[PDB]
Amino acid sequence: VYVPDEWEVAREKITMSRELGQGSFGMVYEGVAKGVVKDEPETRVAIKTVNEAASMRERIEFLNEASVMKEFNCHHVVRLLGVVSQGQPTLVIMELMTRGDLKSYLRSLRPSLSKMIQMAGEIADGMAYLNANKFVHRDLAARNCMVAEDFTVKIGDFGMTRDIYETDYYRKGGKGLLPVRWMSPESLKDGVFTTYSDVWSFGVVLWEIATLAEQPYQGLSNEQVLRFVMEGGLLDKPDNCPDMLLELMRMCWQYNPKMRPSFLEIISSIKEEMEPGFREVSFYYSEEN
Amino acid sequence: VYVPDEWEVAREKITMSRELGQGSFGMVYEGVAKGVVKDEPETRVAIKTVNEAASMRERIEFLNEASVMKEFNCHHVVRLLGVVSQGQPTLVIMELMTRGDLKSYLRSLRPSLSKMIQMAGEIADGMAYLNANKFVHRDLAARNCMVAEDFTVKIGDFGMTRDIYETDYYRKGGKGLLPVRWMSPESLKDGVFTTYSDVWSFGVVLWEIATLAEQPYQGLSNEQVLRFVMEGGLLDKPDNCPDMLLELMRMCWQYNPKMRPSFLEIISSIKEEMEPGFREVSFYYSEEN
Ligand SMILES: CN1CCN([C@H]2C[C@@H](c3nc(-c4ccc5ccc(-c6ccccc6)nc5c4)c4c(N)nccn43)C2)CC1
Ligand SMILES: CN1CCN([C@H]2C[C@@H](c3nc(-c4ccc5ccc(-c6ccccc6)nc5c4)c4c(N)nccn43)C2)CC1
Ligand SMILES: [Ca+2]
Ligand SMILES: [Ca+2]
Numbered sequence: 054v055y056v057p058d059e060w061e062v063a064r065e066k067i068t069m070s071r072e073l074g075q076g077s078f079g080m081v082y083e084g085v086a087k088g089v090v091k092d093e094p095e096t097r098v099a100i101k102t103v104n105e106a107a108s109m110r111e112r113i114e115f116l117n118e119a120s121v122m123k124e125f126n127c128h129h130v131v132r133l134l135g136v137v138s139q140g141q142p143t144l145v146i147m148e149l150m151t152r153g154d155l156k157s158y159l160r161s162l163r164p165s166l167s168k169m170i171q172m173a174g175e176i177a178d179g180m181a182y183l184n185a186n187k188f189v190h191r192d193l194a195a196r197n198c199m200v201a202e203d204f205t206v207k208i209g210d211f212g213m214t215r216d217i218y219e220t221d222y223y224r225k226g227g228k229g230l231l232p233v234r235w236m237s238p239e240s241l242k243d244g245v246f247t248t249y250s251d252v253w254s255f256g257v258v259l260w261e262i263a264t265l266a267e268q269p270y271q272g273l274s275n276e277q278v279l280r281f282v283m284e285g286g287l288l289d290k291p292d293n294c295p296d297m298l299l300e301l302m303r304m305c306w307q308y309n310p311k312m313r314p315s316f317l318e319i320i321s322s323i324k325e326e327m328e329p330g331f332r333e334v335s336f337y338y339s340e341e342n
Numbered sequence: 343v344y345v346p347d348e349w350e351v352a353r354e355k356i357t358m359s360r361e362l363g364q365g366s367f368g369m370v371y372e373g374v375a376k377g378v379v380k381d382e383p384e385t386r387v388a389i390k391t392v393n394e395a396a397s398m399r400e401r402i403e404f405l406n407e408a409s410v411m412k413e414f415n416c417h418h419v420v421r422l423l424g425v426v427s428q429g430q431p432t433l434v435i436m437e438l439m440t441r442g443d444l445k446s447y448l449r450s451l452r453p454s455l456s457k458m459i460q461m462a463g464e465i466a467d468g469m470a471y472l473n474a475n476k477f478v479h480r481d482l483a484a485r486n487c488m489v490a491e492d493f494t495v496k497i498g499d500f501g502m503t504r505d506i507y508e509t510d511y512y513r514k515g516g517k518g519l520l521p522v523r524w525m526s527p528e529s530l531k532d533g534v535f536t537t538y539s540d541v542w543s544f545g546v547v548l549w550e551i552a553t554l555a556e557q558p559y560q561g562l563s564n565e566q567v568l569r570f571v572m573e574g575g576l577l578d579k580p581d582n583c584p585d586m587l588l589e590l591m592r593m594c595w596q597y598n599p600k601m602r603p604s605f606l607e608i609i610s611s612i613k614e615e616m617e618p619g620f621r622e623v624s625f626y627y628s629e630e631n
Binding site: 110194196213219221222223224225226227228229230231232233234235244274275276 | 399483485502508510511512513514515516517518519520521522523524533563564565
């Protein structure tokens with residue numbers, strides 16, 4: 054059961070155009086929304102839809118998982134703008150990230166130390182924010198980080214591990230997809246995700262940044278990755294990777310979860326390298342922190 | 343490992359236009375293929391693609407599962423026309439079914455006894471053919487039957503249970519999606535599919551035809567369907583369903599697999615109701631049979 058509230062948007066206020074790609078729960082479209090942002094008649098938006106064909110259960114979980122974003126207000130986490138819970142299709146309205154996902158962006162360059170570090174700190178800041186709001190992402194990867202008009206990186210789609218719904222197919226136990234090349238040794242073992250395993254994934258994202266989105270554990274099957282990582286195996290250090298990002302990856306990949314830095318500590322160690330602008334928009338320097 | 347052969351088509355001979363929907367292994371497109379059919383410079387075709395992002399393993403299994411169709415030659419099974427195994431994307435070229443899948447077609451009418459029976463016999467004939475060629479479909483459903491220009495129904499996509507590959511996600515054990523509302527009590531129990539469980543699914547297809555593609559076990563969750571069917575539970579008889587199709591469903595849904603008719607026996611019992619044309623195109627009346 055979902056209860057409509059102030060986040061509800063009338064469908065006539067929405068138009069959709071081009072497909073942006075299939076995320077968790079369904080297709081994302083570019084569109085236009087009326088009356089979603091302060092002091093503008095209309096805003097270009099991203100609209101995620103749940104198919105008409107989808108079960109009522111998926112449709113409800115879609116809305117409930119998205120509704121966690123009603124509490125979020127961070128420059129480095131993609132904002133929820135509204136919801137359409139009445140009629141078909143069920144829609145989630147979000148801040149439009151016009152340069153798409155970070156993985157695809159990285160592939161397209163196939164950056165400098167200053168730009169690599171700014172991305173790092175932006176991602177860590179969005180994550181520090183979420184973790185402080187008691188939220189574990191569980192699917193931090195470059196594919197789930199997003200790039201804004203001005204190249205600011207923000208935290209995106211967390212739904213992939215929470216969407217266990219396929220319309221006419223059912224997996225024996227009822228479990229879901231797991232992002233094994235981004236997961237910590239302890240999460241591979243028991244399937245629980247924590248603040249500390251998010252930090253593990255952050256190191257993988259830095260590695261993805263440093264290799265321009267190479268496939269983690271490039272030469273190994275999924276079964277081989279499970280074994281390798283659970284036995285303390287680690288990703289190769291990228292070519293010409295600045296020492297600072299190498300140092301960060303290594304701290305993020307401590308086998309023992311309690312020995313990894315927090316996100317606030319990661320930012321703390323690289324704050325001298327950030328744009329002056331970061332002090333005004335980040336959660337790190339905010340009153341909240 | 344896939345070994346290229348006579349089914350190989352040069353990529354320049356292929357153009358693709360509109361999306362037809364995501365099947366197993368990937369997106370299907372309408373397109374045009376040069377030199378794929380006898381006595382025509384070009385043929386409108388369906389082209390299924392495997393994404394550039396997909397693993398080499400998925401890409402190889404795509405081709406190997408599709409390659410079973412190289413042995414098939416039946417009017418009531420969608421034909422393979424060619425393969426493009428060199429370069430990206432990996433393509434499977436097929437006979438274009440211009441009215442799309444049977445489920446969507448059924449929804450669009452929301453037929454007569456004569457038309458219902460012709461569909462029945464066409465589907466049973468394609469299935470009789472596959473079963474005689476030692477092939478178990480494992481995913482017979484109206485969504486996986488296809489409608490031709492002249493409204494002839496043919497057997498389509500068998501890949502959904504064979505495609506266990508997600509690019510950056512991995513399901514714990516390694517297993518796949520199962521079509522539980524179309525599966526027999528014995529297949530729900532041990533996950534093995536047979537000739538007899540295909541016949542079970544055929545009854546479900548007849549029910550789908552008779553209800554204009556209602557959802558099987560409409561009011562029950564997936565876990566409730568498992569229990570219900572394994573305890574001998576059966577689908578409600580459709581409103582105004584002619585007795586003949588009711589009789590066929592019931593024979594198809596005998597709890598004991600060995601007590602269901604074969605597909606040849608199903609056709610045998612309804613052959614007086616088929617178009618005279620059926621005798622010329624069917625496997626049933628063919629020399630092969
Ligand atoms: C392999 N990947 C497949 C999907 N690809 C597409 C999805 C598309 C996309 N997604 C979003 C977007 C951004 C932030 C989100 C944050 C949360 C959720 C979410 C929704 C429902 C339930 C749970 C989580 N969805 C979100 C969706 C956005 C966005 N905000 N702006 C533009 C494009 N977007 C990028 C990328 C590559
Ligand atoms: C819920 N569903 C989602 C997918 N939807 C779309 C897929 C699209 C489609 N698919 C085909 C087509 C038809 C016959 C096939 C037969 C075999 C395989 C196959 C391919 C690779 C590996 C294993 C099997 N793919 C096949 C694909 C065809 C076709 N031959 N002509 C036109 C459209 N087609 C209809 C329908 C509804
Ligand atoms: Ca889903
Ligand atoms: Ca797949």
